[PDB]
């Protein structure tokens, strides 16, 4: 008769959830990647054959764990910096004298403490209108978010450079990497490869668009857990990047005042030259062709209908505009200059300029309070990046029309990393296995 036998080190796996860790390359960075374990120049990657695995990025726990890890890293990075709670005072703001955005900047003066608690000082500084709100409702003002939570100034020594970090799994577990051509968010993967650690995932922070992200290999990829549902975010991946360049013409001069014992506060001293508005540039031909390709690829999911783009849904400035992290400065660009066109079934530089605004007080994770005061960057600052993904959002009413409206929104921070972790999933290998055969042990 048949008998059962146990097999050790058998090649099977099951879905599970584990705690990953950083594996960046060879601390002062905002992500503290130097403290984590070093990377491996030759990653352990083994190809597979005749294997099918059900992938679902919308249900994996890697993005939810990465979001918490990034939040913890950010909180621990801003913890040892100087607290700016005594600065919540009354500011007597006037205009910028119109040196010639001559209205955005405001020249404010206020009282402040110093090294000696007995003595005080009066200093002047330049601030943006977006970070200033009136208190008397009509001369004198008060900072924004100051009435809700304390202000913390980011340490000028740290850098906000999105250096890549490698996410590895502990022993006894493996990461399944999918290499299928044109693989969307869900569906079974035929070309599966096993790797010990993820690739160069760059934790870039952006919204309404993706910068310095991954790209497709053959055609435009559209991802959504439910394309028929308008409430679901439609993440689209580009096959080729769209270059974008930005510049901040305001030649800033950073000054410093020592408030309290030892710690100091950095502000803007004076602007060299004429006041100018910060903006960004993008080629019209490249963006137009990209929009045409995206509309053509998205037309399949909604039949032979016309596609129309709108300029956001309105509301808060942080959820209706862009958000950059170029050199530590945060830019809020007006996206209305891009998603303004219509497309039909039938179908020189001339770059498109995008006006952008800058805010020193920010809360990237949209949490209630705990805002961070970004110190001003001295001198002119330039930035260049590649556009790889668009965070579209379906909008419609009766839905029986011949046209559809797509607005760039989403406003979810987890959607940024979800566009890069679509090829991975964590599994738990079970070396113990049983199978029947014909043999009997000795006695």
């Amino acid at each position: 008769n048949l008998w059962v036998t146990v097999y050790y080190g058998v090649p099977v796996w099951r879905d599970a959830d584990t705690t990953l860790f950083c594996a960046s390359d060879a601390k002062h960075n905002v992500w503290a990647t130097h403290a984590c374990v070093p990377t491996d120049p030759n990653p352990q990657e083994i190809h597979l054959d005749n294997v099918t695995e059900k992938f679902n990025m919308w249900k994996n726990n890697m993005v939810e764990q990465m979001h918490e890890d990034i939040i913890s890293l950010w909180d621990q990075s801003l913890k040892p910096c100087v607290k700016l709670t005594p600065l919540c005072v009354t500011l007597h703001c006037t205009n910028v004298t119109s040196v010639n955005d001559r209205e955005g900047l405001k020249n404010c003066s206020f009282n402040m403490t110093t090294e000696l608690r007995d003595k005080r000082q009066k200093v002047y500084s330049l601030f943006y209108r977006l970070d200033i709100v009136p208190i008397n409702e009509n001369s004198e003002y008060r900072l924004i978010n100051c009435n809700t939570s304390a202000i913390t100034q980011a340490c000028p020594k740290v850098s906000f450079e999105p250096i890549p970090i490698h996410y590895c799994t502990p022993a006894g577990f493996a990461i399944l990497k999918c290499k299928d051509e044109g693989f969307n968010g869900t569906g079974l993967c035929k070309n599966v490869s096993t790797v010990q650690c993820t690739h160069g995932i760059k934790p870039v922070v952006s919204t309404q668009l993706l910068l310095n992200g991954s790209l497709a290999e053959k055609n435009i990829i559209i991802r959504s857990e439910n394309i028929t549902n308008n409430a679901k975010i439609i993440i689209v991946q580009l096959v080729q990047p769209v270059t974008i360049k930005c510049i901040r013409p305001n030649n800033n001069t950073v000054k410093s005042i020592r408030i309290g014992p030892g710690q100091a506060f950095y502000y803007t001293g004076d602007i060299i030259g004429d006041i100018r508005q910060a903006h960004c540039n993008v080629t019209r031909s490249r963006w137009n062709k990209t929009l045409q390709e995206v509309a053509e690829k998205l037309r399949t999911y909604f039949g032979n209908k016309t596609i129309i783009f709108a300029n956001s849904s309105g509301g808060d400035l942080e959820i209706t505009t862009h958000s950059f992290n170029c050199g530590g400065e945060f830019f809020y660009c007006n996206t209305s200059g891009l998603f303004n066109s219509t497309w039909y079934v039938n179908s020189s530089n001339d770059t498109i300029t995008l006006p952008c605004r800058i805010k020193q007080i920010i809360n990237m994770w949209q949490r209630a309070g705990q805002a961070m005061y970004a110190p001003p960057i001295p001198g002119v600052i330039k930035c260049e990046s590649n556009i790889t993904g668009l965070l579209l959002t379906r909008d419609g009413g009766k839905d029986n029309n011949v046209n559809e409206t797509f607005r760039p929104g989403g406003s979810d921070m987890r959607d940024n990393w979800r566009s890069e972790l679509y090829k991975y999933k964590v599994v738990e290998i079970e070396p113990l296995g049983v199978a029947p055969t014909r043999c009997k042990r000795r006695v």
Partner: antibody
Amino acid sequence: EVQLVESGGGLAKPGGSLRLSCAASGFTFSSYWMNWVRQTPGKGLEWISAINSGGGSTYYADSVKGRFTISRDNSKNTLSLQMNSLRAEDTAVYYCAKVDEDDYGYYYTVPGDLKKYYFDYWGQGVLVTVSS
Amino acid sequence: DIQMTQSPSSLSASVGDKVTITCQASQSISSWLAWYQQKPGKAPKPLIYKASSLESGVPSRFSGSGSGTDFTLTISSLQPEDFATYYCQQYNSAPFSFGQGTKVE
């Protein structure tokens, strides 16, 4: 140059009252201290009052302590001095002056103290006199 | 209170003649003192920024010196104008008292 004028002087009766006004332009009036001085015939110039940027913590000399009052209007960019219980020897050409260094910097209790100033701009003083 | 003393009260001069004006301080004022010039019928104007500093807008011909309690206003009198009453005022003091006033012609 900085424009500074004053007016409001005229004849008065001993023991009565009189009000003076000083106008300023061409500079941030809400960022500099203001002082009042007199010029008697023969005797040199004598300082009689001072005022900070905010308006409070007024300073006065012993010869006019409790008799004169100084005030200013930041919104109107004007300075005023009130005279009460004036006597015969109070006649002189009252000049409206402005300090050179601003009030920005370290301070003890008022943004303008702890700093040593000196009069820079002197307006065209008005004559105030009394008689029987 | 503190009070200044300036001498000589009056002295005659001419174009190119060498003269000098000085003032003394009863208490120590280190170097907090400024000089002023005032023509008859015209408001006084600053002349000396600090004990060893010259006020802006004033010609380089004028100069001065002094420290502690004795200060002397060096005037070569080469220029034909500015023959008015010169005042020595001591700042850094409660009454910011001025000098007696010295006129040169």
